[PDB]
């Protein structure tokens, strides 16, 4: 998004509750009620490794999403293609469901059940985030995954590798110009050797989020901006929209899809 | 007059949109509008003679060489598959 | 493909906005595209109605979405303005006022009456006209 | 019915598949095959480097096999994950086929 | 040619809106006897 949009002060929706993923003026952090489940959820070292920090921290990156979900509840799917031209929510899913080929007289006239059917929906999520725990494993992978390969990286400075010891100090400390030489022309390869596979596992790895990025941000461009006709592309059923929401290292959706209920047989010709 | 400055970024230009249970918005006019998108297709080929390469030309180094199995072998077989990939990336790009 | 062999339905991957054709040309070692997109550019306020109702019976816009300027009702396709007389070959009914929230009130001249109108003054006045032989 | 005949009638159908189970067994002989090499060594055979020299240098060849034997495992595993990202690519582009 | 197809009469609206002038022409009809 080129304009980052702000919610509006009112809250009238027609019945739909969007507390939640809104962002909560309480928290100094510009974030929502979801995603401190999902943080709570989930400087140079003399090694010699580093941590970059992302030039998009936590808060503009909570921002973006607000602006992201400003536009889908006010805006509908329209902000994504030019400017955003608003139109109330009612109307949004009127044209949502009549994108699944559900003509839109069946929304107005079943308004209220399903705004609160909608906002029932929402309740299960913020108890399912919270009860179940192996639920965020992706996320939680992988950061264990950088996380055991610098553990393991760090460790093999301990490995002799051949050599009397793996305090090369020790080795300066013990061993003349030329008896030294041959210990660490030895040691500095299996250094060397353990920092080949480390970043060669770096870039496979790396290449995986890379894909997951591009699958993210069609799944932003589509899921999110508009209505994706690509069945069970966004969410296990018929789509109607989602709600983008950050967390530490990933994204995390909200898809809310249409599902047939209950149903009748009958003949036909 | 010009100097290196340092400052939180903008995200962007804040708009507050007219939101309400009846305000509606409708377009007007448009802009039929062109954008470019550059995607690469395929890297430049290269196959590297394993022997070559670290016994170039030396009988006595490609004796020794060959005491270490497959590798030169394997390196070759790779690269002549990114070839073939580079030719598959090509033609199934531009052969619809 | 799904840009230049057709049109792609999908939001923001054949260029910003809707999509309309793609031009590839070639350039070395890669492909460039140069995506023909829809992006409107005016936009107005407009108030909104999410059905109308005639007499008593509900009605909704087939194609396009309830507007008005402030005194006159129309609908129009929800990306460009071009108001439409509400009429019944442009619309459909369903349910009723009752259920309807926001619905509001508006009469929706079907095509018909009008036209079998001038067929009304022609037949009372042939009785009239009967009336001398 | 001509797609049953059409694929028992070619040999070139089932190209793709028949590529990725050779490149996966290809691979292995080859790792299997490196065993056999004396990678810079007195003798490729492990036992017979113990049984032909004292312990004060057989661990200096023996020693090229463990840098050699497992350069080839650390290339092999190498070439795995190039082709498990590979895999998964089409397989993720399956799974939205399917 | 459709396999499948059964019966039912197929509703005209346009039906209603000439069998309420064909009604009222009736009458009209039926007053002009006075004269
Ligand atoms: C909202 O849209 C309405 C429909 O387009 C529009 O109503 C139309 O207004 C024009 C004048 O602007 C009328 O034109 C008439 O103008 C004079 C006025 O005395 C007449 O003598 C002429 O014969 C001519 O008919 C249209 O008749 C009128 N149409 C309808 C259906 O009402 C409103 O003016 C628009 N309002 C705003 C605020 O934009
Ligand atoms: C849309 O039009 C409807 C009818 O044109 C209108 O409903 C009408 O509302 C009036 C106002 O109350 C009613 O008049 C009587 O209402 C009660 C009895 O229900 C009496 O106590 C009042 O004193 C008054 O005499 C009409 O009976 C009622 N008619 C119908 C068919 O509902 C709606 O209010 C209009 N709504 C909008 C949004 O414009
Ligand atoms: C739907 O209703 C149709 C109208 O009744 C019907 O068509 C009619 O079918 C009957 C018998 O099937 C025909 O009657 C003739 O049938 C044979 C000759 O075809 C003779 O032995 C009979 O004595 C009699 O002459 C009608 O001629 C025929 N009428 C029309 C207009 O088609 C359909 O069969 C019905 N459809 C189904 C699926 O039942
Ligand atoms: C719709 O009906 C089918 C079967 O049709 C029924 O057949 C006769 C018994 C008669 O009563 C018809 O009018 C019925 O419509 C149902 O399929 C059966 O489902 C039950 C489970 O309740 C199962 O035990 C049977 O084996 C099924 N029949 C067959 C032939 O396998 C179907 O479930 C009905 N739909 C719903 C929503 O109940
Ligand atoms: C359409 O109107 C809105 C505001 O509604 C107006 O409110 C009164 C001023 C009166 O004129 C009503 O008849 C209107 O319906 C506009 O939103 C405003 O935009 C300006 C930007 O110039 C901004 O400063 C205000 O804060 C906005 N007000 C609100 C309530 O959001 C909107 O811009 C108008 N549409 C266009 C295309 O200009
Ligand atoms: C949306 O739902 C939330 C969650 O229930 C509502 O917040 C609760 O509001 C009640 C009203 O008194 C309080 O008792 C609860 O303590 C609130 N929950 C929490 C976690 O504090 C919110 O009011 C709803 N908003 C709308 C507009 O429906
Ligand atoms: C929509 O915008 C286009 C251009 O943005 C307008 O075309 C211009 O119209 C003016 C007068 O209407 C002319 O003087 C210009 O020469 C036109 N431009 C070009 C390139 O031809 C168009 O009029 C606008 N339409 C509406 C309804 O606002
Ligand atoms: C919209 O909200 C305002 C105040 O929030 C209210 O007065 C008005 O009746 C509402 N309109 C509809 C159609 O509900
Ligand atoms: C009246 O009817 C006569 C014949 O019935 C016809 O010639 C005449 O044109 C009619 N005039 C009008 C005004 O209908
Ligand atoms: C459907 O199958 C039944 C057999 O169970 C058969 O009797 C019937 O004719 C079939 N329907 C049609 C339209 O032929
Ligand atoms: C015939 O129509 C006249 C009006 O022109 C009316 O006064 C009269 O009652 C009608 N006759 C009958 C029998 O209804």
């Not at chain 1, 003399?46 to 602006?67: C, H, K, R, W």
């Not at chain 3, 009785?127 to 001398?132: A, D, V």
Request: charged letters at 15%.
């Amino acid at each position: 998004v080129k304009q980052i949009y702000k919610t509006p002060p009112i809250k009238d929706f027609g019945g739909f509750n969007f507390s939640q993923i809104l962002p909560d003026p309480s928290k100094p952090s510009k974030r929502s009620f979801i995603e401190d489940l999902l943080f709570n959820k989930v400087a140079q070292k003399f090694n010699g490794l580093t941590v970059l920090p992302p030039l998009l921290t936590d808060e503009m990156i909570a921002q973006y999403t607000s602006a992201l979900l400003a536009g889908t509840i006010t805006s509908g799917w329209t902000f994504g293609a030019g400017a955003a031209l608003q139109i109330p929510f009612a109307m949004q899913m009127a044209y949502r469901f009549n994108g699944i080929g559900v003509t839109q007289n069946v929304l107005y006239e079943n308004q209220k059940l399903i705004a609160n059917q909608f906002n029932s929906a929402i309740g299960k999520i913020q108890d399912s985030l919270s009860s179940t725990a192996s639920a965020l494993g992706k996320l939680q992978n992988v950061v264990n995954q950088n996380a055991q390969a610098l553990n393991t990286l760090v460790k093999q400075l301990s490995s002799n590798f051949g050599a009397i010891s793996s305090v090369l100090n020790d080795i300066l400390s013990r061993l003349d110009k030329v008896e030294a030489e041959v210990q660490i022309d030895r040691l500095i390869t299996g250094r060397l050797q353990s920092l080949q596979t480390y970043v060669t596992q770096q870039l496979i790895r790396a290449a995986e989020i890379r894909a997951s990025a591009n699958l993210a941000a069609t799944k932003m461009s589509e899921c999110v901006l508009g209505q994706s006709k690509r069945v069970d592309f966004c969410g296990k059923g018929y789509h109607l929209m989602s709600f983008p929401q950050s967390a530490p290292h990933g994204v995390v959706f909200l898809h809310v899809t249409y599902v047939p209920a209950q149903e009748k047989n009958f003949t036909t010709a | 007059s010009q100097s290196i400055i340092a400052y939180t970024m903008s995200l962007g230009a804040e708009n507050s949109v007219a939101y309400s249970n009846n305000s509606i918005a409708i377009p007007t006019n448009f802009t039929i509008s062109v954008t470019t998108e550059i995607l690469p297709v395929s890297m430049t080929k290269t196959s590297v003679d394993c022997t070559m390469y670290i016994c170039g030309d030396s009988t006595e180094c490609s004796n020794l060489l060959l005491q270490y199995g497959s590798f030169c072998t394997q390196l070759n077989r790779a690269l002549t598959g990114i070839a073939v990939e580079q030719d598959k990336n090509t033609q199934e790009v531009f052969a619809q | 493909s799904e840009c230049v062999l057709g049109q792609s339905k999908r939001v923001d991957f054949c260029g910003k906005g809707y999509h309309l054709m793609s031009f590839p040309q070639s350039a070395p070692h890669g492909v460039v595209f140069l995506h023909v997109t829809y992006v409107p550019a005016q936009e107005k306020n407009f108030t909104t109605a999410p059905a109308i109702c005639h007499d008593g019976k509900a009605h909704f816009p087939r194609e396009g979405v309830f507007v008005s300027n402030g005194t006159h009702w129309f609908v129009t396709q929800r990306n460009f303005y071009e108001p439409q007389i509400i009429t019944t070959d442009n619309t459909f009914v369903s349910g009723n006022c009752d259920v309807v929230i926001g619905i509001v009130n508006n009469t929706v001249y079907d095509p018909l009456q009008p036209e079998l109108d001038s067929f009304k003054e022609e037949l009372d006045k042939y009785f009239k006209n009967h009336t001398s032989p």
